[PDB]
Amino acid sequence: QLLDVSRQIKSYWLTNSLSTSFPTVDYSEPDLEKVKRTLTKLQNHLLEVSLIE
Amino acid sequence: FVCNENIYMAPNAYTLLATRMLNATYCFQKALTKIEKFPQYNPQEGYTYP
């Protein structure tokens, strides 16, 4: 019975929503300007473009 | 005691009731000793019977 109680206590401690974070494994870089350029490049396929005005 | 051409001891109440109690006890101890070894306890799964 004591072991049941101690287990319950552990579970309770682990049930508490105190994590307040995420695992976050990041560090692969966006290189956005490349995505812009590939977007435009695709969107203007076979299209003669001109300058803004 | 004499009955149907038979002689008997007709014993003392204490020995009768005592022996009865002793039988009952023995049954209890045997049944409990058989059961006590069997059940399994895992603390997350509970009490299990195989």
Curated annotation (Swiss-Prot), chain A:
Keyword Lipid biosynthesis set for record: no
Record keywords: Activator, Nucleus, Transcription, Transcription regulation
Chief site of localization: nucleus
Keyword presence, Manganese: no
Subcellular location: Nucleus
GO CC terms in record: mediator complex; nucleus
GO molecular function: transcription coactivator activity
GO biological process, any: positive regulation of transcription initiation by RNA polymerase II
The family this protein is said to belong to: Belongs to the Mediator complex subunit 22 family.
Subunit details: Component of the Mediator complex.
Biological function: Component of the Mediator complex, a coactivator involved in the regulated transcription of nearly all RNA polymerase II-dependent genes. Mediator functions as a bridge to convey information from gene-specific regulatory proteins to the basal RNA polymerase II transcription machinery. Mediator is recruited to promoters by direct interactions with regulatory proteins and serves as a scaffold for the assembly of a functional preinitiation complex with RNA polymerase II and the general transcription factors.
Protein name: Mediator of RNA polymerase II transcription subunit 22
Annotated organism of origin: Schizosaccharomyces pombe (strain 972 / ATCC 24843) (Fission yeast)
Taxonomic lineage from the root: Eukaryota, Fungi, Dikarya, Ascomycota, Taphrinomycotina
Stretch of the intact protein here: 69 to 121 of 136
From Swiss-Prot, chain B:
UniProt feature coiled coil, ranges: none
Subcellular location: Nucleus
Transmembrane segments: none
Known partners and oligomeric status: Component of the Mediator complex.
Protein family membership: Belongs to the Mediator complex subunit 6 family.
Chain's role: Component of the Mediator complex, a coactivator involved in the regulated transcription of nearly all RNA polymerase II-dependent genes. Mediator functions as a bridge to convey information from gene-specific regulatory proteins to the basal RNA polymerase II transcription machinery. Mediator is recruited to promoters by direct interactions with regulatory proteins and serves as a scaffold for the assembly of a functional preinitiation complex with RNA polymerase II and the general transcription factors.
Name of the protein this chain belongs to: Mediator of RNA polymerase II transcription subunit 6
Organism the protein comes from: Schizosaccharomyces pombe (strain 972 / ATCC 24843)
Upper lineage: Eukaryota, Fungi, Dikarya, Ascomycota, Taphrinomycotina
Section of the entire sequence shown: 109 to 158 of 216
